[PDB]
Amino acid sequence: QGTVVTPFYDSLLVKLCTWGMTFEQATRKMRRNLIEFRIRGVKTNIPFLLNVVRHPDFASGNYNTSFIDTTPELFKFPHIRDRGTKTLRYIGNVTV
Amino acid sequence: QGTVVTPFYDSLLVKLCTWGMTFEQATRKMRRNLIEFRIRGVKTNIPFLLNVVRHPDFASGNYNTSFIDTTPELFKFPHIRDRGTKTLRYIGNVTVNGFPGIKHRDKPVYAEPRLPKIPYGSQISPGTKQILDAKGPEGVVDWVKKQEEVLLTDTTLRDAHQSLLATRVRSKDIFQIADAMAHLLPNMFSFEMWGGATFDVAYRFLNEDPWVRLETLRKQIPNVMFQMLLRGANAVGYKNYPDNVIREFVKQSAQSGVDVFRVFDSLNWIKGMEVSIDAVREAGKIVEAAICYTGDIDDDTRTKYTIDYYKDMAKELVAQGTHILGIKDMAGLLKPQAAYRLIGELKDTVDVPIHLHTHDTSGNGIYTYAAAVSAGVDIVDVASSAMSGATSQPSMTGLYYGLVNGNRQTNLDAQNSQIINHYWEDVRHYYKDFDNALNSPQTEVYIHEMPGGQYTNLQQQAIAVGLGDRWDEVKEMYTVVNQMFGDIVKVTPSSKVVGDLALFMVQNELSEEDVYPDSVIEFFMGEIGQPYGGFPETPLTDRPGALMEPVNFVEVKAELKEKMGYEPTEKDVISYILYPKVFLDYQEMINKYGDVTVLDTPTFYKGMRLGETIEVELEKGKILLIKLNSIGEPIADGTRVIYFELNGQPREINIQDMNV
Amino acid sequence: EAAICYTGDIDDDTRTKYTIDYYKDMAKELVAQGTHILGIKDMAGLLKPQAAYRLIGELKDTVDVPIHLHTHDTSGNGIYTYAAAVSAGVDIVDVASSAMSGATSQPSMTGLYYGLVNGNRQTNLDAQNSQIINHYWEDVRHYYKDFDNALNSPQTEVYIHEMP
Amino acid sequence: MNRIKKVLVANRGEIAIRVMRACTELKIKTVAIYSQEDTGSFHRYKSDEAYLVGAGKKPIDAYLDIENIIEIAKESGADAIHPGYGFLSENIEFARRCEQEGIIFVGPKSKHLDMFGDKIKAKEQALLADIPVIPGSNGPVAGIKEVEEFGEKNGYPLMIKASRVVESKEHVKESFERASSEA
Known part of the structure; x- marks a missing residue:
């Protein structure tokens, strides 16, 4: 790792x-x-x-x-498909 | 994961x-x-x-x-045991709680010390050791007498750092240079590398084995002879001991690598020294019975310590037998004019070679040596420029350039000694926490006659007592206390006794007239020994060393084995006998954190900075790559997790915070 | 006090230019140009003690004026270089209070006194007095720790680079 | 296990590890060697001991410091050295040098590496064994375009090899200048 x-x-x-x-x-x-x-x-x-x-x-x-x-x-x-990362991009964006 | x-x-x-x-x-x-x-x-x-x-x-x-x-x-x-985890425990601990005894501060970015390069396969030039190996003590003393030049003993590994840095210099830093010392200082008469306070401090404050230090060096430096300093009566101990432990100690030391033994009693009483001096003759190794210098020979006001008295005492030490006669000026009191007189007058009085130890507190260190060299003395104590001066010995390189074109000289490659210095110049910075020494000529020394070590150690007690504001009053009271017992040789452990009482009188506002503590009664008992004057004011009567009965080595050896985790070596046992409280404490600490001797000094005292990566060599070929990433937040009971990468593998350990 | 600045090495002849003769000669012309006293300003600390014994004795021969010596203790041989001068019979030397002596400064006044105290030649100064003065300076220097960037051990390298 | 008590693994990475695993399975102590750039590689932590090798050397050059490795081998007490693959696996000087110092070398005798050192001396060694071989030049094709003559006699399409491919004609020129330069 x-x-x-x-x-x-x-x-x-x-x-x-x-x-x-x-x-x-x-x-x-x-x-x-x-x-x-x-x-x-x-x-x-x-x-x-x-x-x-x-x-x-x-x-x-x-x-x-x-x-x-x-x-x-x-x-x-x-x-x-990296559906997961893009989801965090959104979430992180609107969070800040 | x-x-x-x-x-x-x-x-x-x-x-x-x-x-x-x-x-x-x-x-x-x-x-x-x-x-x-x-x-x-x-x-x-x-x-x-x-x-x-x-x-x-x-x-x-x-x-x-x-x-x-x-x-x-x-x-x-x-x-x-995982040595690795225990190493992180230590590192993590000092990183959050700090090293004991010193202001918790960030680990600096120390410059990398300048190491001398040696060409491959070079040198190994034979040293003075060979002459002891070949022709015993006498054969050396002969070669000594034969040399027209002045001979030098390097105290850079002792006294120098004992005086300046509280004896805190660590084995790790010493070993690093020892190779170059053999290559580049071969013509030295001796290297003073053991004894005095180093023994107890290694176990007490460093968690290092002094016996290792000795033996590891012995291999690194085969060519030059090794010298130590031994308080005859109680060896390197704090208390008095029976005669067998002393003889045992010296036997071991000689076995391990010690070649020359400067031995003194704190009162200049040759009776206390007798036990240990014989052990060295019986070890078949060099004895340097040494006379501790006090008062003033050139000022005749004082009756007790006359130039005659030192001439007389030197006869009786040649009679008691000593391959060499050294003069230990522990305070820096030997004014240069008095030195010209004393060397010339003692070369007349006795046939032995002479060896002089002085401290540069006064500013007259190098001059006091030039007086000796003019008066024809054989051997003197110096240290690398970067560890010379103040309460240390005078610069080796300083002396050479001082005597360079005179009648008599000292053979050392100037440039070499400087290269060795460049290392020490750089290394001393590791110890700035302990570099509390004053950095200008302290001329007051002659009045109070107090050794450099004592001035700082007694300043500390007054600060402890909260008499730091009255410090000047203590210094004077001390001089009275020596004057209360007439005039006595002030040096460890006798020095301690004066200071202990001085501090009591000044504490209770008692004048010498008003007058009419365990350590002081033991002085008046005679447990330190016999004062030359034998001042008046139950009876110790005779040497406490002899009066002591011996404890069988085996009963203890088993006691320790049961105390320690396993079966001890012969050396482990003497050490326990001499310093029992500390030796167990050392053991308990080594079990908890493993062999710390190995860590680079800054990491030892300052732990680790965040995001820092370090390597530690536990043994030949066994290196731990260690990085500290971040430090956890405290929980209820103060514990916090420290986040490491030992060998790239993340690890996590808990260290208990002491103060938020 | 017309003063001659000292450079190079008089005892080492490898470098000839600044010969013991050349300083002897140069001192003549300064007595000729007229000077109540002749001082020697050793601004770097280069005057090794053996060279000082030679130079004072050789200049007291060369000229009748009194002599005054200024040296810096960078080398660690400051007090010894004076003792050489006093043995060779020089008249005046530069010292400072213990607490401001040493390093790139002059040698201790109180240091010198206790150095020469029972020799053939001496300096008459109340030891205790000079110490009382020192106690002040001891304490005062702390005000200036910001400017106390000086190294506090004998820097022997000075002879090579010869810098001030 | 008999005369090998301890073994040095004169390699890095996957292959190094496999060897260590083999030794440990056979109760044989193991010693690893790592370049400055490989202080991190976890092959070094998988051994019983480890030492840096290619000090100041360019990263690939580091694992080929033959002499250094033997000093490390000797200082370690290593009865034998396993060179893995690549690096010094086939290097004769090293193979020989082990035998000189009495370090066992895990692999064939240096005479074997010598005969197979170049592709040509092996193809040569192949006929002596009397086994099928590709039709080719009886020595190394030292002449540039001496091929076309050799090419004219045998095939339309030809491959060029050192110790690139051709369909004959004009291509011969373009292939050699880069083939021999690449080599």
Whole structure:
């Protein structure tokens, strides 16, 4: 919780691995976990990873080095709902 | 992190499972994980689970329902100190209540002290210690006699700060420079670094172990010899003791690193010194029996302390045996003209080398030394410029530049001594709270003959009594009180006795004529010893040290072990014997806050500023990053939570406020 | 009192320009230009005590006038530098009350008296008197703590930078 | 556990921690090292002891102060040193230097790092083992555009690698000047 990220060293916060009897099972657990993560204070690559893990060609298990780059969709991201913060903005504003 | 546990539902925080190819593998991972967990704010069952997981019958894999209950050990838990929490307790405490004895003030932004750089692998040039190691005491005394130059002893680590700063300089600050002292002041005859008041003050006011200070230095400075100051009769103690403790003390001290022992009795009675001097010969280490100087030799009005008397007394101390004869001028009374006479007249009287200690209260400190060097004395006491002057010794660098092109000189690299000074210049600021010394030549000293330490200590009692407005009246009354017991050598603990009564007479408006306290009766008893004149006005008769019967070391050693948490070392025991009230008090304080020796001085005295971050080295390679974020608001009973980050991890501790 | 300001080091010959001869010579011309007394103004505190013994003895030889010495106790060798002068037989010296002596000031008057008290040469001043005067100044200096920014231990570095 | 009683972790971050965890699981004392910029990183608090390393050094350079690390290793009493990955993991000088001071180095012998030091000497070492390899230049392609001749003989599309991609023709020029400069 406390930590500050410096730019000097690499960007890695946590390595998340999931396991399953079948790769299809493991992909599910990865999905859930990536969503479940709550990190605030810095941007992360989660939404990217989600798009690659959601992608059906990934779940197939047949991909190649050229799988990224060839697929641009992964770089399109859903708008962030941050309903909560904006609510506090209002409340804080009218309060002062 | 945020959650609060309610009592309504079950107690479970987290389920921890570990896996392995072999159960023995899994048990290992479980062990590590359980230790790794850091949960604070609530008690947990972890220490219990650890004991069951550590238990060998568990690792075997053969257990039954009756495995717990049948085994009680699991319910016994290790008494773990976290040095870390206790450190925050101290820091938080002084941050809100302040350090005892001094105005609560904000922690300044002290400049970083200028440390000398040493080139890697340099020097280690051999010192005078080698000559004691090689050829014993006599072989040194020889090398002494052989040197044409004047030899210097550095009192920067004692007296200098004892006089100026109430002996409050802390080991942490001393150790930091000791390396450079070995490299850059090797040609010193000795370093005075122990004894006098430092011993009791370390335990009493600093919560540091003097024995550590000694031994740590001993390693840092192998080359130069170590010197201390010992009140023969009662060593460094407050009271008189039996002869075995004294001999024990000196034995230890010699073992730990002390090489030269300046020893004096407060009355200049050689009988009180006898016990301790033999111990040093029996230690196989150097004796500097020293004559405490009083009155005026050059002014003949006074019959009692004649130049003859000091010549005579010096003979009897060479007879009692002393590798060196030192003259301890504890007040600064040795006028420079009298010094020329005394060194020349004593070099004639006896063959031993001579060593002179004076205080610069008068302003005639450096001149009194030049007189001695002209008259050919061997060794003198000086201190770094930044800790010289006033009630301290004269500047080492001052003396060098004083004698620089004369017939006789002193070999020290000027520039070196200055680099050492730059450190101390910067460090003294840490102790401004204790720097109550007057900063101009106080010439009045000759009238009252009171040692620098005593002037300030007795000013304090008069201020305590509320006679600060009449202070001038006390100073005069004191001189009468010495004159009531004829003329006697005023020095700790004999000095204290005069002042204690002086303050009584002036308090009750009694003239010397009108006249017709425990400490004073003990003087007239003879418990301090025997006054040279032996003034008239039940009988102590003989040395109290000898008359004391010894307490067996083992009976006490066990007493202490039961008093202390655990089994004590040999050193811990003597200390307890000498200062029992304080030693326990020291122990109780160290248990509460841990080893404080380590904290940087400002943090020790001033705590922490808000948003400040500091590091503290508890041991080699063990550093606590500590930040103070904010301080909680008081509650009903005055308690307030202090908000810290120990190692980036937020922590919270309660300190009880004393005054809103 | 035509006075010669002292600089450099007479005892150290590495720097030649201000030689013991040069001050001896310069004193001649000031006796020639006419001066009832010759004073030496050591404005920095540079006159080491050994150099003072030499300089007074060498100038008493060089010229018949009485000599008057002003030094600053920055070095810690203030009183000693005077004792050197008194041994070498100089006539007049500058001192101040104990409470205003020391540091960048002159040496203590009462300090000097008690320094020379039973030597061959002395100064006749009632010790106790000078102390009574001092008691005043002791007390008065506190008014000026705002301006008492002076350092209160021997600053030996002075010889290097030579500053006032 | 036998001759390793204590181990130094010549790395930072995730990987450092994993090692510590391994040691502690094996009753082995651990020593961490942190740069000035890493006084905060919680890998340093997860060890049994820790020391600053790269004093005054640029932040990445700090974890590569080989000599410093050995002094720290020696002063610590560290029987062995684990370099993790990246930093000095593959550095020969360090590997060797451990062996010189008798500090066990957790990893292969320095001869192994030597042979695989460059990509070329490994691809070389691969044929000696008699296993499939990519068709490429029998030495490092020291000539600039010596490729086109080498490129003419083998394929339309080629990749360039050091110890970037090409479709042949004009691209060859643009790829090398940046590839070798990037390297």
